[PDB]
Ligand binder design. Structure first.
Ligand SMILES: *Cc1cc2c(cc1C)nc1c(=O)[nH]c(=O)nc-1n2C[C@H](O)[C@H](O)[C@H](O)COP(=O)(O)OP(=O)(O)OC[C@H]1O[C@@H](n2cnc3c(N)ncnc32)[C@H](O)[C@@H]1O
Ligand SMILES: *[C@@H]1O[C@H](CO)[C@@H](O[C@@H]2O[C@H](CO)[C@@H](O)[C@H](O)[C@H]2NC(C)=O)[C@H](O)[C@H]1NC(C)=O
Ligand SMILES: *[C@@H]1O[C@H](CO)[C@@H](O)[C@H](O)[C@H]1NC(C)=O
Ligand SMILES: *[C@@H]1O[C@H](CO)[C@@H](O)[C@H](O)[C@H]1NC(C)=O
Ligand SMILES: *[C@@H]1O[C@H](CO)[C@@H](O)[C@H](O)[C@H]1NC(C)=O
Length: 479
């Protein structure tokens, strides 16, 4: 029925396209790929799966395939090409509310398009990812983090309601007020319980511009203390965005130039500073202030900090230009053939109490004497802005750090071994980290990830909403 309407494709080109992802490390061929024209086509697929004894196929929902390790694959199953839902000109897949207090976006829609539609109405989401060509449904199935998360929470903390089609093939609207169990389960739920077809996203009046700063440190203690100062609850401080970067000695000049922030003269100055201090690691805080008045506001904030004098670097850009900054990085890297390469990325949340230990073992230890390509990102988050009732798993401490080591790749094998070594260091040091964007491959690891109480809830929701265990099998939780 769906195949006759040209929606369910089994041809080699279709299956091949749905068999690889951004990670470029693992691959898995699906039996078929659905190209739905409407949510009705998704209901039809999931209802058939629910009602058919001996239903053969697991089902995955491909956003834009930005997964690192096959999370969007359905080996010998059906991959849903979610993007197809946004093919038609009418009706619109992104609706800013009449009063401009929220935006309704299709699960398949990319955040860059959500931004553009929001700005047309003078508004914008409050919480972002660093990179905007990701789907609403995709990031909400994980968490969605960037430099705003310390004060607004992750993207999953900025959703009012969702439309979800469950593994039973039932279309359900959920929120804190209605079907809250499904609402909580789906958010950070790794595509396990149903497909998000619509999410209601909180917005704020859009700032016009961003004052954009980078501050340089050679001392980790000063660097991390200042990050924590900038992101501390008062309500929060003036800064709209706070992240940080780590630069190892061997690839210092190259990595500093690769930020796209520093000029060649700026890079030379930082290299000279590291040299005079014999520093093996350099650290940079990246922060923005959304808006003569800005000058004094910025001066007042910087006066509370302890970066190396003479090493505050400033840019002033349009708000939208700041948010979409990484798009220009992709275009440039792809032209050099350096974008579509293996990405053995390591992402985790590290408790505040152990971040100095992590720095000693990893940045000052394991990563020393290697040529690093890709950013090493480190910044604090506030647990208070996360809802522990949702599926997403975080460390127990009030403050924990996002640590994102975004390695680009003989080299791949070395990098995979290096990541195993970093994880081994953390385990032996007894650091109670949580991975982010990673899939585990056995039960014990997944139970450890969630913790006993949250795992038991996760299973309860799985039995209620996907009892056949069909959905997002690439997560390797129930498959
Ligand atoms: C590619 C990449 C990823 C990325 C990033 C930069 C790059 C270049 N920067 C990020 C950032 O700054 N902050 C952050 O939180 N994440 C960042 N990412 C990682 C990204 O969030 C993940 O890749 C995420 O999966 C979103 O990517 P995408 O939208 O392409 O989704 P997918 O990989 O195809 O699918 C991921 C899993 O989710 C399930 N899924 C997908 N759509 C839905 C819907 N609508 N409903 C329910 N589940 C869904 C898939 O089945 C899969 O398991
Ligand atoms: C954006 O709003 C429009 C209303 O203008 C929605 O379009 C309707 O969608 C329903 C269900 O998909 C259809 O039955 C109607 O025919 C559509 N009406 C119109 C006027 O075209 C659209 O669904 C909204 N988009 C999202 C993602 O919420
Ligand atoms: C990774 O990308 C290359 C193209 O550069 C391709 O030949 C290869 O099949 C891909 N590998 C995986 C596992 O996706
Ligand atoms: C799911 O399958 C059951 C049969 O076990 C059936 O009673 C129910 O109506 C189905 N739901 C949908 C929406 O397909
Ligand atoms: C930094 O690396 C260079 C090699 O490129 C080396 O000459 C220098 O001694 C290193 N500095 C420190 C303090 O490790």
């Amino acid at each position: 029925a769906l195949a006759l309407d040209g929606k369910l494709r089994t041809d080699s080109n279709a299956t091949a396209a749905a068999s690889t992802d951004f990670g470029n490390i693992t691959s898995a061929l699906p039996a078929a790929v659905l190209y739905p024209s409407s949510t009705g086509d998704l209901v039809a697929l999931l209802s058939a799966a629910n009602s058919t004894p001996g239903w053969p196929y697991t089902i995955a929902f491909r956003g834009r395939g930005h997964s690192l390790m096959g999370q969007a694959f359905a080996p010998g199953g059906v991959v849903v090409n979610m993007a197809s839902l946004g093919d038609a000109a009418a009706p619109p897949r992104i609706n800013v509310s009449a009063d401009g207090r929220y935006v309704d976006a299709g699960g398949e829609q990319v955040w860059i398009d959500v931004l553009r539609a929001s700005l047309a109405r003078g508004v914008a989401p409050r919480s972002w990812t660093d990179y905007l060509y990701l789907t609403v449904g995709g990031t909400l199935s994980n968490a969605g983090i960037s430099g705003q998360a310390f004060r607004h929470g992750p993207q999953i903390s900025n959703v009012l309601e969702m439309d979800v089609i469950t593994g039973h093939g039932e279309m359900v609207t959920c929120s804190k007020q209605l079907n809250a169990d499904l609402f909580d389960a789906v958010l950070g739920g790794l595509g396990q319980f149903g497909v998000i077809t619509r999410a209601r996203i909180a917005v704020e009046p859009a700032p016009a511009r961003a004052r954009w700063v980078r501050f340089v440190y050679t001392d980790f203690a000063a660097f991390s203390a200042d990050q924590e100062r900038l992101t501390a609850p008062r309500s929060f401080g003036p800064m709209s965005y706070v992240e940080g970067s780590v630069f190892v000695n061997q690839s210092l000049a190259t990595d500093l130039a690769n930020t796209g922030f520093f000029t060649d003269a700026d890079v030379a100055r930082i290299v000279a500073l590291a040299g005079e201090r014999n520093a093996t690691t350099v650290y940079s805080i990246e922060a923005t202030l959304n808006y003569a008045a800005v000058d004094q506001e910025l001066a007042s904030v910087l006066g509370t900090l302890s970066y190396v004098e003479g090493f505050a670097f400033q840019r002033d850009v349009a708000y939208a230009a700041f948010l979409d900054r990484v798009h220009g990085e992709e275009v440039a890297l792809n032209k050099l053939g350096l974008w579509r390469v293996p990405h053995p990325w390591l992402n985790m949340f590290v408790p505040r109490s152990r971040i100095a230990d992590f720095d000693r073992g990893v940045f000052k230890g394991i990563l020393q004497g290697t040529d690093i390509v890709g950013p090493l990102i480190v910044y604090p988050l506030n647990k208070s802005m996360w809802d522990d009732g949702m599926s997403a798993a975080t460390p127990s401490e009030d403050v924990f750090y996002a640590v994102s080591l975004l390695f680009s790749s003989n080299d791949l094998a070395r990098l995979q071994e290096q990541n195993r070594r970093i994880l081994r260091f953390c385990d032996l040091a007894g650091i109670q980290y949580k991975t982010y964007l990673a899939r585990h491959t056995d039960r014990s690891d997944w139970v450890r990830h969630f913790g006993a109480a949250k795992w038991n809830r996760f299973v309860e929701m799985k039995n209620k909403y996907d009892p056949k265990r069909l959905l997002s099998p690439g997560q390797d939780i129930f498959n």
